[PDB]
Ligand SMILES: NC(=O)c1ccc[n+]([C@@H]2O[C@H](COP(=O)([O-])OP(=O)(O)OC[C@H]3O[C@@H](n4cnc5c(N)ncnc54)[C@H](OP(=O)(O)O)[C@@H]3O)[C@@H](O)[C@H]2O)c1
């Protein structure tokens with residue numbers, strides 16, 4: 001009926017896949033659509049009859065509708081369902097065809113699928129797609145990985161549909177590297193999102209608990225903060241949330257929302273542990289959510305555990321600014337950690353990850369978009385082999401000038417009893433990373449004492465075991 | 470040569486010493502190692518003992534009285550898998566195979582199921598106390614079928630350490646399949662946490678108070694007489710005595726500050742992340758080791774990243790005492806975290822772990838032997854479903870009284886620029902745990918704003934979504 005007439009194909013007509021399909025169609029292409037449950041594909045075709053969509057009832061019809069090399073994008077449920085869908089397609093595809101998985105996929109799955117499909121002569125592009133439903137429709141940040149020759153054939157469409165960066169119109173997509181490099185970068189992006197959210201949460205909690213500020217007051221502070229170097233979409237979201245009234249009562253909706261946070265957030269931290277990378281801030285943020293889910297225990301504990309009962313006496317304006325600095329500083333700690341993880345992963349899996357570009361493509365179509373991403377890109381433009389962001393001139397100056405405030409904020413908060421797990425982690429990482437010598441000599445001694453694990457010395461090469469008895 | 474009542478495979482530090490422990494209880498012990506020269510060394514150095522030198526597995530298996538009792542202390546992972554694979558075909562129905570290495574519990578769980586109907590009884594056990602523990606009395610944490618346990622319980626009790634308090638052996642049934650190796654994994658997690666807390670304390674005494682190793686040794690010596698009385702503090706004061714064996718000065722000052730690890734701490738943090746358990750103190754200590762391995766980077770950073778240079782001008786005796794309190798306070802938080810994880814693990818894997826007994830068997834032959842273990846046991850006798858140690862009167866009281874000192878120590882450390890990731894994690898955990906309300910309400914608002922993830926309300930049951938537009 002429409003044999004080899006479609007330029008691009010999408011499997012999965014839930015909102016994301018539908019939205020992507022429409023994004024692609026809007027760019028001047030005929031797009032074949034498929035969904036396991038056909039009624040859903042019917043609904044899409046019926047309400048978009050004016051578009052160049054090709055309605056397909058079966059995988060055979062779907063595959064047959066596409067020009068070769070076939071470019072097919074999976075937007076189906078992650079895990080077993082994506083493997084089922086891949087397995088369903090394999091027999092119909094020709095050698096040289098290109099499958100693309102745009103689901104939030106754990107990267108080792110992508111690495112396996114890519115390898116297995118390559119034995120069948122099928123290219124596999126594991127692609128991270130940020131921005132949610134609106135992003136899929138209008139412009140996502142995309143992080144593709146897989147065979148470079150295949151990706152070069154998909155690139156034009158991705159660059160056309162991707163979010164364009166507001167500062168220079170550059171598409172928020174680029175080739176990340178082989179096999180699972182694409183979904184790896186997306187994972188780190190999701191970790192980073194968790195960390196940015198927890199840091200804003202602490203900033204909010206300090207302003208509320210210690211300085212006693214109202215929601216309107218805190219809204220104003222975030223607004224003012226967002227006009228400076230902190231400029232970020234998450235802060236914009238935050239000051240918007242603080243405006244809104246309760247839809248089923250009096251006051252503000254944010255004060256009615258139960259503090260039990262909602263999975264896959266653990267992935268970045270899991271890889272960090274596996275790779276030997278210190279990723280304390282994002283991992284503390286994950287654990288911040290976990291402990292909020294222990295609400296019932298905290299209610300009990302709030303009634304028996306003691307803590308300080310202070311009324312703040314200092315200068316409110318001075319401390320608000322000290323908190324502002326602590327936020328930017330700590331956010332910088334988290335990104336340094338996250339890009340150091342990316343560096344290790346790149347060595348481990350041999351991906352030559354393009355670090356400056358990753359920051360560039362996060363400038364739009366994703367929740368972590370912020371202006372200071374440009375400073376990250378500046379840093380790797382200057383030196384692609386930069387081991388850690390903290391060593392670049394810009395970030396050296398920031399930390400030199402902001403660390404004092406961080407410290408005052410930590411003393412203030414800890415003395416008052418306000419929990420600040422990420423802020424405290426930030427300054428602990430700064431003071432660890434810059435320590436020429438750490439007390440790990442003592443740990444090594446202990447391990448040798450009880451376990452005979454051996455150690456290295458400071459004055460000569462070799463492996464040594466002391467006789468402690 | 471069927472003289473042998475017990476058999477040990479692996480003649481590195483742990484297996485050699487376990488063999489000698491068992492032989493000293495009045496048994497003849499078969500010994501085997503893959504490199505034969507090691508087995509030769511221990512045979513020749515102990516001709517007075519009743520050991521059977523074997524050079525093949527066929528010989529080793531042949532030398533044991535049926536039903537055979539064979540214990541492996543082999544390098545974890547692939548080596549252990551292969552050793553067992555080689556050994557299984559030689560074994561007879563009724564024989565008992567014990568894996569006493571630090572095996573990742575999923576491997577043991579898999580092994581148990583595979584061996585279920587083989588007629589070969591299987592036990593995966595944790596072993597504590599290091600080389601001297603193995604020689605004189607280890608704490609042991611075995612899991613498997615209860616029937617298998619009961620066949621090795623008698624000899625386990627004989628070799629086990631005996632608690633000084635009541636003479637009770639430091640071994641007990643932990644539960645089904647991988648329960649034992651899981652409990653040992655948490656043990657090591659708790660241990661990483663205390664080791665890092667001790668290291669931080671050392672760092673504070675050395676860098677802020679400016680104290681010599683003699684002065685610091687004396688301090689830890691006094692602490693060990695009080696409520697801090699523990700294995701790790703005991704050996705810490707021993708390490709700080711010893712002088713360099715290949716030069717002048719103290720050995721601890723000649724050991725390179727690159728902390729090694731063999732995966733048990735990492736595994737604990739990974740299980741916490743999978744299970745939804747907040748485990749910041751222990752995880753921060755794993756990351757503290759990871760950052761110690763980034764020595765080259767830290768040397769580079771220390772020349773570029775600036776920080777405070779304050780001179781402690783206060784009362785040293787008073788600050789030392791605050792550090793003590795803080796250390797005991799934080800030690801407790803590590804344990805409270807560990808047991809909270811054991812509770813969640815027990816539920817997930819249907820193990821019904823005996824929390825109170827675990828504490829009992831850690832009273833000797835145990836790297837994490839501490840004075841307050843009975844208070845842990847008391848707390849669980851009182852309430853079997855106790856959710857967290859911090860809810861028990863005993864620990865409520867300690868935290869009430871020492872909490873102020875933790876805050877002064879954190880504040881002093883942070884103003885001085887000395888990294889204290891585990892101390893800051895401790896008070897952050899405490900302050901989060903006792904918080905009835907945390908700022909996860911803002912996180913949920915944000916998530917519902919950008920992804921429509923839904924939220925619970927503070928005032929009514931049900932799932933809600935807000936129309937943010
Ligand atoms: N050391 C401690 O403080 C301590 C405490 C508690 C538990 N553990 C656990 O107990 C077990 C043994 O510990 P350990 O410290 O005595 O020594 P280890 O270094 O972990 O293991 C060495 C033993 O494993 C064998 N082995 C190593 N690689 C092998 C391979 N690729 N294939 C076959 N066999 C191999 C060695 O034989 P060869 O001599 O021929 O190389 C040797 O007998 C480990 O699982 C460890 O985690 C250790």
Ligand SMILES: Nc1ncnc2c1ncn2[C@@H]1O[C@H](COP(=O)(O)OP(=O)(O)O)[C@@H](O)[C@H]1OP(=O)(O)O
Nearest residue numbers: 012013014015035036037040076077078081084085
């Ligand atoms: N086992 C499976 N095999 C093939 N496709 C599947 C699948 N499970 C889910 N999907 C597809 O995966 C899509 C939904 O995945 P998802 O969990 O990411 O959804 P959403 O993002 O809407 O929550 C749907 O198109 C679904 O097809 P149906 O519309 O027929 O349900």
Ligand SMILES: O=C(NO)[C@H](O)[C@H](O)COP(=O)(O)O
Nearest residue numbers: 451657729730731732733836
């Ligand atoms: O189980 C043990 N002692 O508890 C072993 O010595 C173990 O190897 C110690 O952990 P680590 O070697 O990862 O530091």
Ligand SMILES: [Cl-]
Nearest residue numbers: 146147178179
């Ligand atoms: Cl590839």
Ligand SMILES: [Cl-]
Nearest residue numbers: 130131366367
């Ligand atoms: Cl996003």
